[PDB]
From a paper:
[name] is a bacterium that preys upon a wide range of other Gram-negative bacteria, entering their periplasm and consuming them from within. Structural studies reveal a variety of domain usages (and therefore binding capabilities) at the fibre C-termini, placing these on intertwined trimeric β-prisms. Using independent but complementary approaches, we identified and characterized a MAT superfamily of trimeric fibre proteins with diverse adhesive tips, able to fulfil the long-sought-after role of multiplicity of molecular recognition and handling of diverse epitopes (across a wide prey range), by the bacterial predator [name].
To address the potential for domain-based diversification, we crystallized the tip of [name] (which shares 75% identity with Bd2133 in the fibre region but then diversifies), from S818 and S914 onwards, diffracting to 2.6 Å and 1.4 Å resolution, respectively. The tip of [name] has no similarity to that of Bd2133, forming a β-sandwich of a completely different, square-like shape. Tip trimers are mediated by edge-to-edge contacts, burying 6,900 Å2 per monomer.
Residue numbers in the entry:
A (entry chain A), B (entry chain A), C (entry chain A): 948 to 1151
């Protein structure tokens, strides 16, 4: 059995007063329904929480889609990128965060965008492993085209210079900002910084 | 057309058994409704997910409000802060996380709070840019007053010493803990650490 | 008063057309109900948002459970761990993120797992404080057993070598990957990296 109940949340002297919506379902194998969600009188939503204090109060974990491995490499070989959203989608979905686990990103712009600062032209060259690491991607804009702010940490990453020489290899972390650049018909790294093992790197 | 259906999730030999709530809406331009949300028999909520494994299982992005630029500067000039929540609101909303994109924070306490550790009295002096960066703010408490744990990374940040001398400028990241201090009638930085380019800084 | 309304989201020439579900509740002390949640025609859920652009669009904060302090220490003394989930639970809840505030983790493997790389065998030895810091834990897998990717930053952390000698103490940040290792009947640190004050550490 499942049901939706409207429940008073205070005494009602006038016919009208505070009220909430509760959503009840019966667990498999059970015979009685139990309250699973509430939209409270204050608009707070409780999921497994009866008196939510947060606007979205979740008594458990939060899951989003696995968007795979992200890459954006501009070098002597040309412009490439693997990005699981279009420019138009990112622009339509401003401010949205996405977190998932996957192999690390491959990131470089040794032509223009990330060839200034202390470590001009480096490649954050993640080796995909079973361990991988968490991505965090939030959608933003240059004002005309889609941009993303991307974070990832995990195993294993090779930091290479613009000549391809491995400078270090091990654990890697990066914060990077990418944008869709119409002048090269693809996503590019505008700036990024992070670390491989104990070595910080920065380019812009 | 929109509708709410109560659906059995297993065979029912006794009149009672497992059941879920499904919420159907019709996309604009469509003629048939499609299932958009489920509150499952186990209480898991699926949003675009039919058999959610997570308590809140979202087939897309998650958005929260844009809370703007955050600042808390105590120096020779006095005590200032720009904080988009009151002390009372933070105390009423413990444990809540907030993520958004905006210009970086401006942070310093060269009088007391962040004038110890390796980089006593520095200012994390973010220049607001179109790129900005992601904030993460989670609400906490000293036990009496509101505290926040704040993270931000992005472009562009000037690291200054307590005398105003620019030590470095470029990409910046900070983790900082701020609290509402009644002794100065405002928010202050209790401790923070991060980096500008490849230079780590730490104060407490 | 509380209510659930099915509302057209466009003109309907044929009997069928786009529609949304709105959920209305009355705030305590109020006499009229106000719209608190919408499941839109496109399946986007707005919580305090009338025309959500995100699949889960929340006009406020997001809260999850406080899972306490996490530890996993393997050294000369043996194998210990404090982990608020079982192996089976983590494996059933892949891809789920969890964020909360608590005292920092205690992490080391000086026998095998984290006794390579630049800082073999170190202990990230968090001292629990009232300030604490934010955890982020996302669930993953080795392919057979539960793994977690864990992040924490905050006050106060002692970085110790494998001999117990305090190398540094102050603000601490860690990214660590832990997994349930049946060969020692407990969770262990596979690799981690972070910083105490301005000192980066890395082990794998």
């Amino acid at each position: 059995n499942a049901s939706i109940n409207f429940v008073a949340t205070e005494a009602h002297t006038a016919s009208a007063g505070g009220a909430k919506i509760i959503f009840n379902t019966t667990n498999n194998g059970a015979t009685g329904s139990t309250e699973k969600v509430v939209i409270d009188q204050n608009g707070n939503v409780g999921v497994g929480v009866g008196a939510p204090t947060a606007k979205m109060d979740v008594n458990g974990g939060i899951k989003q889609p696995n968007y795979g491995i992200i890459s954006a490499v501009r070098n002597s070989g040309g412009v490439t990128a693997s990005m699981p959203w279009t420019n138009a989608y990112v622009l339509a979905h401003q401010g949205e965060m996405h977190q998932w686990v996957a192999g690390g990103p491959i990131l470089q712009d040794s032509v223009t965008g990330c060839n200034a600062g202390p470590d001009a032209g480096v490649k954050f060259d993640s080796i995909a492993t079973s361990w991988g690491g968490p991505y965090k991607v939030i959608f933003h804009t240059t004002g005309s085209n889609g941009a993303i702010h991307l974070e990832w940490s995990g195993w294993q990453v090779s930091l290479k210079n613009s000549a391809g020489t491995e400078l270090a290899i091990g654990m890697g972390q990066v914060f990077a900002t990418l944008h869709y650049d119409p002048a090269v018909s693809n996503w590019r790294v505008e700036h990024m910084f992070g670390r491989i093992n104990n070595t910080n790197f920065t380019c812009w």
